[PDB]
Design a protein around this ligand. Structure first.
Ligand SMILES: Nc1ncnc2c1ncn2[C@@H]1O[C@H](COP(=O)(O)OP(=O)(O)O)[C@@H](O)[C@H]1O
Ligand SMILES: [Zn+2]
Length: 263
């Protein structure tokens, strides 16, 4: 069974700029674009995880998407952390890809929120965080996450604590993790790199993010601060992509360079 849901997709306008600003200064995103939207959603969820239920949907352009709804209410600012994290990863990955150090390209799945609405008057408008909370609360529902459907053989490549999948090693992913820390000047590290690999393309989902600032990604269970960053680097070996990029090493690195895998 499936029915129509109408409402608003909420994204961040000018994401590149806002992320670049969020990263350089210390100031949260305070700008959210609403776009009226209508999908067909299944009634029965086809999967659950620890925290939420997963429904198949079609978005109107005909794309296969997944709608995710949480088991019980979570406040907006928590859901927003997942979105802010995803937009950091996409922003980092786009830059990294553009370096053209590797024939493999990284794509984190887009995440946005959706809220059901009888009305379309916020369509095309940018709202503040407070205004977004009021539009969510007018609904009295926790918003859903929406992301493109991903099929294929799913693999966890690097966890958020120094573990490495050895038989599915790709040097592009390890150099990416290392580089995220270089590009953000030691502030953060992207790991929990996992998803699907097809035709030189990694479709990646649910990454973790370690931040040196305790006050920064406060809800994430997978953020392990400076300790997480150290854990990654203890087992990290700079590979031919790290070398090609001249990545300076974290001081916790002890192991010698390796030259297996890409390039
Ligand atoms: N394309 C997709 N995007 C998101 N989730 C998907 C997708 N395809 C399948 N799923 C299913 O969603 C399940 C649970 O979703 P997940 O996001 O992990 O929920 P939880 O956050 O509670 O762990 C996954 O194990 C998988 O079975
Ligand atoms: Zn390295």
């Amino acid at each position: 069974y499936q029915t129509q849901v109408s409402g608003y997709i909420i994204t961040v306008p000018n994401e590149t700029t806002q992320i670049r600003k969020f990263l350089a200064s210390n100031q949260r995103i305070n700008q959210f674009l609403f776009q009226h939207s209508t999908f067909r959603v299944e009634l029965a969820p086809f999967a659950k995880g620890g925290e939420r239920l997963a429904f198949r949907a079609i978005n109107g352009r005909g794309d296969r998407i997944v709608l995710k709804r949480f088991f019980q209410q979570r406040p907006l600012t928590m859901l927003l952390e997942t979105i802010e994290r995803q937009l950091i990863c996409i922003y980092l990955a786009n830059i990294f890809n553009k370096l053209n150090v590797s024939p493999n390209k990284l794509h984190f799945l887009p995440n946005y929120l959706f809220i059901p609405s009888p009305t379309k008057d916020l369509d095309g408008k940018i709202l503040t965080l407070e205004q977004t909370e009021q539009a969510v609360a007018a609904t009295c529902r926790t918003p859903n996450f929406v992301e493109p459907y991903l099929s294929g053989y799913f693999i966890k490549y690097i966890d958020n604590n120094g573990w490495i999948n050895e038989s599915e090693f790709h040097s592009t992913l390890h150099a990416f993790a290392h580089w995220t820390w270089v590009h953000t000047k030691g502030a953060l590290l992207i790991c929990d790199i996992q998803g699907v690999n097809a035709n030189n393309k990694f479709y990646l989902t649910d990454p973790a993010l370690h931040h040196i600032d305790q006050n920064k990604f406060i809800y994430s269970e997978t953020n392990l601060g400076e300790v997480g960053i150290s854990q990654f680097f203890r087992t990290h070996q700079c590979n031919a992509i790290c070398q090609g990029l001249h990545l300076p090493k974290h001081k916790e690195q002890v192991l010698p360079d390796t030259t297996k895998g890409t390039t």
